Amino acid sequence: YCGRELEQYGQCVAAKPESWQRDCHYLKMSIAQCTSSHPIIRQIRQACAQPFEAFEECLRQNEAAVGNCAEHMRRFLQCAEQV
Numbered sequence: 001y002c003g004r005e006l007e008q009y010g011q012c013v014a015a016k017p018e019s020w021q022r023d024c025h026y027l028k029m030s031i032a033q034c035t036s037s038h039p040i041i042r043q044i045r046q047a048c049a050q051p052f053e054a055f056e057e058c059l060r061q062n063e064a065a066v067g068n069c070a071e072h073m074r075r076f077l078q079c080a081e082q083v
Contacts (some may be wrong), residue, residue, distance in 0.1 A: 001034075001035050002034035002035060004031055004034065005031040005034055005035060008024060008028075009028075009030055009031070011023065012024045037039055038076050038079060038080070039066075042081050043083075047079070047083040048066065048075070048078050048079035049081050051075050052075060052079075054069075055069065055070075055074055055075040056071070058070070058071060
């Protein structure tokens with residue numbers, strides 16, 4: 001979970017208990033992208049670079065057998081486990 005996520009979640013609940021629906025639609029989704037896809041930044045991509053190579057190499061060589069490996073959620077988890 002992200003530093004821009006917990007602050008804005010905090011404001012939408014602190015205003016009113018149902019303002020977690022009412023105070024933020026677009027911002028509730030853009031903070032959800034940070035915990036759904038993570039940032040595209042070079043600083044993260046350098047540390048999980050071996051996963052980031054291997055999960056592209058699944059769809060490079062074996063795109064027809066993605067039940068054996070899939071990218072975006074597996075590649076992300078190996079980043080959050082290191083950085």
